Structures are given as C-alpha cells and as structure tokens.
Amino acid sequence: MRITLVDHPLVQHKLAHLRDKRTGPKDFRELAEEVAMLMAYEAMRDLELEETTVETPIAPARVKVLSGKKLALVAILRAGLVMVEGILKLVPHARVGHIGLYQYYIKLPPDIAERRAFLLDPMLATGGSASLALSLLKERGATGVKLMAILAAPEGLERIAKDHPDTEVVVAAIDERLNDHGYIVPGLGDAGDRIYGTK
Amino acid sequence: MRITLVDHPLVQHKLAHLRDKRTGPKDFRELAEEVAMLMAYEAMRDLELEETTVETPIAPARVKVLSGKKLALVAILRAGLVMVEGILKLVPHARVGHIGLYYIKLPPDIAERRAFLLDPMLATGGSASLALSLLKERGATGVKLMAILAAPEGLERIAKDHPDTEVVVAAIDERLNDHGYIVPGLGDAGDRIYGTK
Amino acid sequence: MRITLVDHPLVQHKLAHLRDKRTGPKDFRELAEEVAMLMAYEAMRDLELEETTVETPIAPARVKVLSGKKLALVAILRAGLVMVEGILKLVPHARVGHIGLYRDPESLNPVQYYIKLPPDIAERRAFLLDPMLATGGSASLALSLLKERGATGVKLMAILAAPEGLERIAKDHPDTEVVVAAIDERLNDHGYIVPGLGDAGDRIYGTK
Amino acid sequence: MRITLVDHPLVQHKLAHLRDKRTGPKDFRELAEEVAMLMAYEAMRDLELEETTVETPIAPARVKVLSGKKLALVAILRAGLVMVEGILKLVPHARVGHIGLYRDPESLNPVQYYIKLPPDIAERRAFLLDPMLATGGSASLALSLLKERGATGVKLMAILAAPEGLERIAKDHPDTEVVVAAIDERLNDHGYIVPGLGDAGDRIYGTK
C-alpha cells in the first residue's frame, strides 16, 4: 500500500495551527480547506491528459486537457465535507459523493467506474470508517481510489493496508497512536467539532 | 538563469481553457486565479520553517512553522491583480504591494520578506525588469517572478537585467508577434480577465 | 405562521438560471450559494445590536456590535450544505449544525441518519436551511429535532416552496418563520415541486 | 443629492470591527468584502428585469432575468479593489473597470495613473467603488472620467463618507447617487475621516 506524505512547508505550518488548541472554528475550517487544496496538488499529479487543438485570440495552439469524465470527490460525513469545499476551489467541475456511517447513507456520482476518485477522511484513526467506505466504493465499481487524510494513526494505516492493499493514502502527517478514547495522538482533537463549532 | 516550469496536469488543463478564445471573463478570471494558486505550490516549496511545540486538545505536539515576517505578493497592474487574489486563498496573511508602469506601494520591511512578483504575461520582460529594479532599490531580495506565459525574449531580458531572479512559469511560448503579443499566448490578459478591451 | 417572500431582482434572475435544466452542477451550486447569501440579508436584518466603543487609528468611536452568542446555521443534508456555504461568506463565525435526512421515494417521508448542533442552541439565533420545501415532511422533522433541543425563533430558509409544504409547517410548527424566494404551484405525483427545478441535491453535486 | 444609508445590523457590526484599530489586514480585507456585499444588495434593488421562460427538469416555467448588458463595477485603486471582489461574489459576470488614483499628501488632490473601463459603459448599470469618501476629490474626478465616456446613472459606493466629501460630489456631480455605510464627523488636518478607520488601502493590504 502506497503512503504518500505531503511535505510542503505551507502544509506543515497550517497543520501546526490546526493542532494548536487555541485555534477557533473559523480559522480551523479555513486552514483545513487550505490543507485539502494543497494536498490535492500532490494527489492529482497523475491526472491523465490528452492532446487537442485550441484557437487562441492570436493563433491556433496545441494543448492538453484532462481525459475522461470529471473526477469524483467522496466525503465521509461529517468532517470530510470541509475537504470537499477546499478542493472544489481547485477543481469546481468535480462531481461530489457523500458517505455517512451509522446502516449507512451513500450518494455517489453516476458511472464512478469511469472517474478518478478521491476519498476524503480528515482523521484516519482506527481506519474503520475509511475501510468500510472503500468497500462501498469498490462495490459500486470504483477503481484506483486515493484516500486523503490530514492526520493518520499507525493503527489506521495498518487497517487500510490490511483490507484494501491496492489503495494509496495521501496524508499530511502520521502521528504516534490512538489514545484511551480513540483519538489520534497528539492529533488535533475532534476534527468535526473544531470545524463547525459543535464542541 | 533560474527557471521553474510548473508541471501539473491541472495547470496544463486550465491553461488550455485560458488560451481558448471562447473562454469568457468569468471563467478566465477563475481559471487564472486557480493557475496562480497551483503555481504558488511550487514557488513556495522553499519557504523556511522553524521548530516549536504547541498544545493540542489531546497533548503536546512538536511542529514546524514558517519563520520570519509574512511573505509579500507584489502585483504588476493590471493583470497581476488576478494572481494576488488567487494566491491569497492559500496564504491570506500575505502582505500585498502594487506596481503600475509610476505608481508603487509595498509592505514595510520587504527586505525581510520572501517576495513574489506577479506578472501574468512575461512578454518583452520590460515591465517585470523595471519592477524588479524598484524592488531591489527598496531592499527586496531573492524575488521570484511568477508568470503564466513567458516568451524567450522576456526570459532573456530578465536573465540579462536580473540574473538573480528565479522565474516560475506555466509555459514558455514561441515568440512575440509584431505587436508585443505572446505567440500563441492567449491575447490580452487584462481585458480577458475583466471584460474590457 | 409567518412567511417572508424575498423580492430582489438578483434573486429572481438567479432563480431563473437555477430552474433552467441546462444549468450544470458547477453553476447551479454557485447560483444556489449566491441566492442563499441574498436571502440572508432579509433574514438577518433583525439581528440585535448593542452599543460599545473602539479606538480607531484616528480617534475613539461609539459603535454597535451584535449581542449574544454567535448565530447557528443548520443544514439539512445534502442540499442545505450549499446554503450554509454561501451564508458563511457573510457570517463566517456562525456555528454550523447538520441534520441528515433523505426523503423515502415511496412513502415520501423523511429518514433520519444524523444530527449535530452547536451547543447553547437556545441562546443563539437559529436558521434552518434546505432549498426545497415540498411536502414539508423533512423540514418539519428537522424543526422538531431543533425544538426538542431548546431552539426557538427558528427561521426556515428555502429557495422554493409548494403551498402544500408551507401548510405542513404551519400545521406542525406555527412558530417557525419561513423565508422563501418563490412559492410554486404544487407537487407532482412523485413529490416534486412544479415547476420547481428538479432534485436540488443531484443538481448541486452532480449525482443520480 | 440621493444618499442611501445602508441600515443593516451586519453592516453596523462589521463597520465597528473595521473601525477598531486592532483589526489586522486579513480580517479587515474580509470585513470590507462582506460590507461591500451587504451594500450591493440595496444598491442593486434597482436592477431592471425582463420576462421569459425556461424548461425545468419538471416543466416549463415563466421567470424573470436581468435585462440589457452586464453591469459594471469600477474600482478606484487601491482600496476599491476589495469592494469589487466582495461584490463579484454576488454578480460574477460583472465587467470590472479600474481607475488608478492616489492622493498627493500635500494638496490632497488626486493623481491619475490608470483607467480602463468595460466597452459601451453607456449601456450598463454602473457602480463606482471607493471605500472612503474623504474630500471627495478622487471620486469626483473618477465620476468625471466615467461621464465623458458615456456612463450615466452611476451610483458611488463608499463605506464611510465625510460631509465635505458628500458636498464635493453634490457640487461637482449632483445627479450622482451615493450609497454609504455611515456618515462621519469631519476630515482632520491630513484629510483623514474622523473618526473613520485610518488609511483603507494600507489596512487592507498591510502597507504604510
């Protein structure tokens, strides 16, 4: 299982502010969105292109545009929503799906088998939600799905490599462990609550 | 000289739409802002950091933070404005300067700030070179010049006048026609961004 | 029950573009955000203020600021999300809540799958967001969920509403104030607003 | 002359934070965009509409859309830029003009270093944006520029206006309609609005 760590200094810096317990919901949400955008640069380096011609105001021009259907961003409710908003600023034509667990709620774009797909899950703690989500996506015919997380715990990455080995995980950072209550350590607290002000 | 070609399919795709003469002002503006954002990812990969610790809701955490003052984004009017707007989405704390070629306003102590000069179209390199001089006179150092499209001409003008400056570009075009327009380029950046002519 | 019909040229114009079936997800999502922003002007014109003073870089100044805790924006997933995003551009410090409900295609009744609200809800001005008020079943359930948790003076903001839906809320939650951009004709056999604009959610996120 | 005092709690509140000297460039910039958007709501209740039809996914619908060409937003650099950005969030298809003007810190008279306007501005609803209406010298010149190029029915939009500024515009361009967030006391020895909020441009971009 490929684990891609986004290194950029802007990611590290913003991540420092996200962890800082003194950062309020407004800044936390904006930061989380910026991190998502930055991480998407890395996660989308391999987007396939095709050649075509275009007429500029000055003269004809050989150019390259993305091939196939519009990519799909799939958010794991609730915190995953913040990553979608961030990333849509980079790719506004992206189709969006949502998956909420506990039965489960799922809505995906049509023909997801012919779309590059990205699963957004801010905190990869135990990896259970991400795992199940990946299963639902595979089942619908999704392939080559990239799991994007801001923070990941060893226990979580292991969980994914164990159930979906052929999945790439893009993360800003890998922490030490999960505490007595299932939270990533040192992590940043409850992602959802810190994003929407629902402590 | 120092040149960095931004290599990302999103950039290639968006530049394709910018060049297409059918893309209207709204989409052009949004596209230019997105390209500016993407290009900023590379242009800022070398921002310096410094270690420190912070208290998370859960426990102490070792982290790295940007060092020094806040970075400066200097726009060359008018087209440069679109790039400032796009880039600010990534670094909203950045200080902004403006140069119109005549008029110039910059953040204080720019000599102590990582600076980025924004000029969508590096054609003859004339505007950008003058701007770099004005910036050098004011203590600016290690300036990266960011252009969407560049002509070999402008690149050579900058290599000759300011060999110290690094140039970040999205694509290097053929030449300049007998009207100073980049070929194949995309026309008048400003007019296409704002809907003028 | 009180209903506030929002009348503004930009809202009508954009609503025309939202209804047009030729409008794809990107533009539809942006239009919905803009409409929400515009409707927020009227729905928040009654926010309470209190006097205070600040130092200007020129001199002291007597000013007025909002009083009380930050307001709460509660979205009914999925379509409500777009309204919350647009409104946050005006009031970025607002706290956000989410109520997950999807309408059963057969019974046309709401199915709950999630709810999360800011704390001290009874102490904040509350706004419930969901673009389409059809039968009113989902909004009514949401209104109940908010009520049982202490919310009061709730303003339900919808872009389009069917008379049937308005009647359902007046019946179930008379104290609710409903702000809308337009009132349409009726619902069809499948529970869709006519002429309406189709399935908000699918048209916002490009789903089916 | 016609003066609209945008009266809305969100505007008063945000104005309070813009005035407060502790507000940094990032927040100041966001606040100005937000205030500009709220003000645009009033300034554009004016937009003429026309009747037409479209096909919704459900059925045909009679609707209304804006008539004529896209409206023009003309900013007075530098400070005007922030207002254009905020307002674009509501009307993204608007054409943007730019008039470069700065005030000689001596004669308090404006110096012109740039002007670019949308084509056929005579057939577009126009809005001139300049956060601070101090002596009014800048806005007055700007209005003269717009006038000679065919613009008419122009609404000058400012966040703060001083009496001497309104009088200057009332004197040079009486037909101009002004929309403001608040009218202040006077101008100090340096031409700054009292109590105002200091130098707008500098506070927006972090210059000095």
Curated annotation (Swiss-Prot), chain A:
The organism's place on the tree of life at top rank: Bacteria
Pfam families per the UniProt record, alphabetical: UPRTase (PF14681)
Cofactor binding note from Swiss-Prot or TrEMBL: Binds 1 Mg(2+) ion per subunit. The magnesium is bound as Mg-PRPP.
Residues that bind uracil: 184, 189-191
Signal sequence coordinates: none
InterPro entries listed in its UniProt record: PRibTrfase_dom, PRTase-like, Upp_B, UPRTase/APRTase, Ura_phspho_trans
Catalytic activity field: UMP + diphosphate = 5-phospho-alpha-D-ribose 1-diphosphate + uracil
Binding site for 5-phospho-alpha-D-ribose 1-diphosphate: 78, 121-129, 190
Keywords: Allosteric enzyme, Glycosyltransferase, GTP-binding, Magnesium, Nucleotide-binding, Transferase
NCBIfam families: PRK00129.1 (NF001097), upp (TIGR01091)
Function text: Catalyzes the conversion of uracil and 5-phospho-alpha-D-ribose 1-diphosphate (PRPP) to UMP and diphosphate.
Name this protein carries in UniProt: Uracil phosphoribosyltransferase
Species the sequence originates in: Thermus thermophilus (strain ATCC BAA-163 / DSM 7039 / HB27)
From Swiss-Prot, chains C, D:
Residues annotated as binding 5-phospho-alpha-D-ribose 1-diphosphate: 78, 103, 130-138, 199
Keywords: Allosteric enzyme, Glycosyltransferase, GTP-binding, Magnesium, Nucleotide-binding, Transferase
EC number in record: 2.4.2.9
Protein name: Uracil phosphoribosyltransferase
Role summary: Catalyzes the conversion of uracil and 5-phospho-alpha-D-ribose 1-diphosphate (PRPP) to UMP and diphosphate.
A GO BP entry: uracil salvage
Homology family: Belongs to the UPRTase family.
HAMAP family: Upp_B
Substrates-to-products reaction catalysed: UMP + diphosphate = 5-phospho-alpha-D-ribose 1-diphosphate + uracil
GO molecular function annotations of the record: GTP binding; magnesium ion binding; uracil phosphoribosyltransferase activity
Essential cofactor(s): Mg(2+)
Textual note on the cofactor: Binds 1 Mg(2+) ion per subunit. The magnesium is bound as Mg-PRPP.
InterPro entries named among the record's database cross-references: PRibTrfase_dom, PRTase-like, Upp_B, UPRTase/APRTase, Ura_phspho_trans
EC category name: transferase
Pathway(s) this gene product operates in, as recorded in its UniProt entry: Pyrimidine metabolism; UMP biosynthesis via salvage pathway; UMP from uracil: step 1/1
Gene3D superfamilies for the chain: 3.40.50.2020
Binding positions (uracil): 193, 198-200
